[PDB]
């Protein structure tokens, strides 16, 4: 019942911090955002930039999405991000993640009017 656009913001936006605090950042955020409520979501990326800068990517470099579609865009410059990936020992409901902070380019799929990001394809 929540729009695709709204769903992108809730899963991937984190403008409150400039970067991952500690090795426990992922464990905390995946819970806070309700991502481990019914199962352990396996993979998720959080972006530490302003909403305006992330939305502007839909006007940058056009590339192909992993599924063959052509509505994906790559950011001109690198951004501060945090990758979260579930560990091998992890079993619902005791969800655990590995936290990896870095500076990379992001790739998102865009749609609508206005044309904003609706999916997170990958980081480069
Ligand atoms: O680098 C990646 C790859 C996938 N995902 C996540 O994994 C899902 C696909 O399996 C993506 O769905 P969504 O685009 O609809 O949000 C995204 O949430 C990330 O967060 N980062």
From Swiss-Prot:
The chain holds residues 27 to 150 of 150 of the full protein. Disulfide bonds join 26-84, 40-95, 58-110, 65-72. This is Ribonuclease pancreatic. GO terms for biological process: defense response to Gram-positive bacterium. Keywords: Disulfide bond, Endonuclease, Glycation, Glycoprotein, Hydrolase, Lyase, Nuclease, Secreted, Signal. Pancreas. GO terms for molecular function: lyase activity; nucleic acid binding; ribonuclease A activity; RNA nuclease activity. It is found in: Secreted. Belongs to the pancreatic ribonuclease family. Endonuclease that catalyzes the cleavage of RNA on the 3' side of pyrimidine nucleotides. Acts on single-stranded and double-stranded RNA.
